[PDB]
Design a binder for this molecule. Structure first.
Ligand SMILES: *[C@@H]1O[C@H](CO)[C@@H](O[C@@H]2O[C@H](CO)[C@@H](O[C@@H]3O[C@H](CO)[C@@H](O)[C@H](O[C@H]4O[C@H](CO)[C@@H](O)[C@H](O)[C@@H]4O)[C@@H]3O)[C@H](O)[C@H]2NC(C)=O)[C@H](O)[C@H]1NC(C)=O
Ligand SMILES: *[C@@H]1O[C@H](CO)[C@@H](O[C@@H]2O[C@H](CO)[C@@H](O[C@@H]3O[C@H](CO)[C@@H](O)[C@H](O[C@H]4O[C@H](CO)[C@@H](O)[C@H](O)[C@@H]4O)[C@@H]3O)[C@H](O)[C@H]2NC(C)=O)[C@H](O)[C@H]1NC(C)=O
Lengths: 212, 216, 165, 110
């Protein structure tokens, strides 16, 4: 017993998109469908219920339909805040009855302007050093689209040893963020002249640096 | 009308998880509602688990037979909480668990998944819990806290105990090949209020009863 | 009609999570001394203090005509409306592709028949292979519980007789 | 809108009442969620009412439209009043009665 959605769908600002949801006679074929909008990893919001009553404070650009055993979400005048994951749901009368969510579909608004990654690079604090340890922190924020290459360096040479890097992740402004960490001994840091966090983004290179 | 989900953040495989959902806020409302539990693995689809009716005593549990015999759902009307208990936990059950409402207001259709709690992460692992070490990263202008080596997720940051919220960015944690997590939170601030304003970040890691406060 | 297959069209224990399914019984329809009701229709009433608008469709995947019976209920006083369906201005509506009639509860004073100042109209319809029938209600619907898939014969009929079989 | 039958014959008048699927359609079509159509002859005289509902889609339409007719007699006037949902008569027919005509079903060629 499942509800099938497309893995993902896309559009350009202004257009209508329709995400489709397909079930079976004991669920969509019998019951009203609800649509949920989700921002990645926060709680989902109710968009549609009763097959399209919008709950108080959902724009009327959101509309839905049910016919036969499939349903369909309709988002008109596509805007930026609209980029999220969308789920359909229905009650099902099989067995003792249960609720069913669809697989969800990933929705991206395209043609968004590109952006430079802001890069901050901290050095250890006395405390961390006094604890016989050292960690450099490189924070990379507000970039788009979601790809970026890191490069750490002791003064001249490339260092891969002691490097940890997150994959990129979206923030609620649609701009992405990541972190790359280089942890060293107390001797390494105070041994060289300076270390550097270098990020490359669509063939662009920003880099910061610090001395002990 | 508010909902807080709450329960262990960590559970050993084969143990039983009890999550409770607490309701806050009064109602002079002529409506009943049922409560559902719904869970979401990281990066995955929502999965409905169970539901229980507020004025009724009737309940439903996912036909999902990998988990129809492990779930139990109960209400305590007097304490206004709904309890989910799930026996025989596996790592595969690691997920964000939500309780959510169905609102029944008379003559409209059903307030289907009305109003969601914020949801709790629940990680199933044999790994032992470990509290973080918190270090200040010193200095518009920028400064922050480094939250190092803790298990498992998640952790909470605040600044000046919530007073400071403008310009703040807490970054998604990183997974060290060591098994342990670390993250960083930062703030952008007026470049000439440094040493005119005290900055203390507050760190909570509930899984290890660790509360550490640290001034930059 | 020479035969049919009775089938549970909306199962009582699973079709109606938001409505009360256990209180629609009446001394007028009693069984073994206590209040009861038809076996083939379910009388939905309000759960707690609220009776949300229900909508329920059935599609006829039987490849035969399906006879669907149901009822609209008309209680005597607005107090009963409230206690039963909580919506003084409710309605029931039923649409097939062919059949298509919205009904409306008419609260009135009637002499008591089988000790009941309320009345209930029973309705039927033949939903054709492929067709879907949808019920929408904010009270007063006596939902179908069991329905019948029909096998057409010919030269059968109904007779009135007191001769023994 | 009234029409008086000055034709000295029966006039057949056809018209329709429309029943859209959602209250949103009511609004976009006739702007009056609680509308009505009413039609009165001297003989014929029935007020109708739009019943917004969910129907399976037939010819891709969750809306339905009932067609209606009536014979307005020489001299009589027929008046239509509406706040939405009326599919007005555009062309109507003045009738000449014969007898012993009829309708047959055939696939033979003329
Ligand atoms: C199955 O069918 C039988 C009919 O064979 C039916 O039982 C019969 O029902 C009537 C109504 O209950 C019974 O007649 C009543 O008898 C009582 C008690 O002695 C009288 O009080 C009644 O009179 C009052 O109510 C009447 C209106 O309903 C008024 O006319 C009158 O003035 C009084 O106020 C009434 O006459 C009858 O006793 C039985 N018959 C038999 C043989 O038992 C049964 O109810 C049906 N079952 C179902 C589920 O339909
Ligand atoms: C004049 O009369 C002709 C009928 O001779 C009529 O054309 C016919 O109409 C039907 C409906 O449009 C057509 O059948 C359809 O074919 C399409 C496309 O291949 C199918 O998608 C349709 O199936 C869908 O919709 C059905 C319900 O309407 C569902 O039953 C089904 O499950 C699908 O969802 C449908 O079968 C048919 O092709 C033509 N016939 C011919 C010979 O062209 C025309 O519409 C009439 N014109 C007017 C003005 O009335």
């Amino acid at each position: 017993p499942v509800l099938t959605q497309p893995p993902s769908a896309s559009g350009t600002p202004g257009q209508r998109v329709t995400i489709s949801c397909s079930g079976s006679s004991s669920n969509i074929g019998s019951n009203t469908v609800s649509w949920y909008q989700q921002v990645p990893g926060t709680a989902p919001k109710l968009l549609i219920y009763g097959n399209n009553e919008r709950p108080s404070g959902v724009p009327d650009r959101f509309s839905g339909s049910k016919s036969a055993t499939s349903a369909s979400l309709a988002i008109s005048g596509l805007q930026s805040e609209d980029e999220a994951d969308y789920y359909c749901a229905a009650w099902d009368d099989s067995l003792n009855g249960f609720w069913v969510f669809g697989g969800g579909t990933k929705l991206t608004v395209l043609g968004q302007p590109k952006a430079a990654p802001s890069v901050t690079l901290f050095p250890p604090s006395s405390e961390e050093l006094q604890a016989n340890k050292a960690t450099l922190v490189c924070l990379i924020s507000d970039f788009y689209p979601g790809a970026v290459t890191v490069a750490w360096k002791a003064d001249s040479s490339p260092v891969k040893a002691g490097v940890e890097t997150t994959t990129p992740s979206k923030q609620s402004n649609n701009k992405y963020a990541a972190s790359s960490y280089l942890s060293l001994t107390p001797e390494q840091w105070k041994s060289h002249k300076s270390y550097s966090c270098q990020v490359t983004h669509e063939g662009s290179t920003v880099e910061k640096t610090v001395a002990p | 009308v508010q909902l807080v989900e709450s329960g262990p953040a960590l559970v050993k495989p084969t143990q039983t998880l009890t999550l409770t959902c607490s309701f806050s806020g009064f109602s002079l409302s002529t409506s009943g509602m049922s409560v559902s539990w719904i869970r979401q693995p990281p990066g995955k689809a929502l999965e409905w688990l169970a539901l229980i009716d507020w004025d009724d005593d009737t309940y439903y549990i996912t036909y999902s037979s990998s988990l129809k015999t492990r779930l139990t759902i109960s209400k305590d009307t007097s304490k206004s909480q709904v309890v989910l208990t799930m026996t025989n936990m596996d790592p595969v059950d690691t997920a964000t668990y939500y309780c959510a409402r169905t609102l029944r207001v008379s003559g409209d259709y059903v307030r289907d998944f009305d109003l969601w709690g914020r949801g709790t992460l629940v990680t199933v692992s044999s790994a032992s819990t470990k509290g973080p070490s918190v270090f200040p990263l010193a200095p518009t202008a920028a400064l922050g806290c480094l939250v190092k080596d803790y298990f498992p997720e998640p952790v909470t940051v605040s600044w000046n105990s919530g007073a400071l919220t403008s310009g703040v960015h807490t970054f998604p944690a990183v997974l060290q090949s060591s098994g342990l997590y670390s993250l960083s939170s930062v703030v952008t601030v007026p470049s000439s209020s440094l040493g005119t304003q005290t900055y203390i970040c507050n760190v909570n890691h509930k899984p290890s009863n660790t509360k550490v406060d640290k001034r930059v | 009609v020479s035969s049919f297959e009775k089938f549970e069209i909306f199962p009582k224990t699973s079709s109606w999570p938001n409505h009360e399914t256990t209180k629609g019984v009446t001394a007028a329809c009693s069984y073994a001394g206590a209040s009861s009701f038809y076996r083939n229709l379910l009388w939905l009433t309000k759960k707690g203090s609220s009776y949300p608008k229900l909508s329920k469709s059935y599609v006829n995947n039987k490849g035969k005509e399906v006879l669907v019976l149901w009822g609209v209920h008309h209680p005597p006083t607005g107090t009963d409306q409230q206690s039963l369906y909580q919506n003084a201005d409710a309605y029931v509506s039923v649409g097939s592709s062919k059949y298509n009639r919205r009904f409306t509860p008419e609260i009135a004073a009637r002499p008591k028949v089988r000790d009941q100042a309320g009345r209930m109209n029973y309705y039927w319809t033949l939903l054709e292979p492929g067709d879907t029938i949808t019920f929408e209600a904010t009270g007063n619907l006596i939902a179908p519980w069991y329905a019948f898939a029909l096998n057409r014969g010919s030269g059968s009929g109904i007779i009135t007789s007191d001769a023994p079989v």
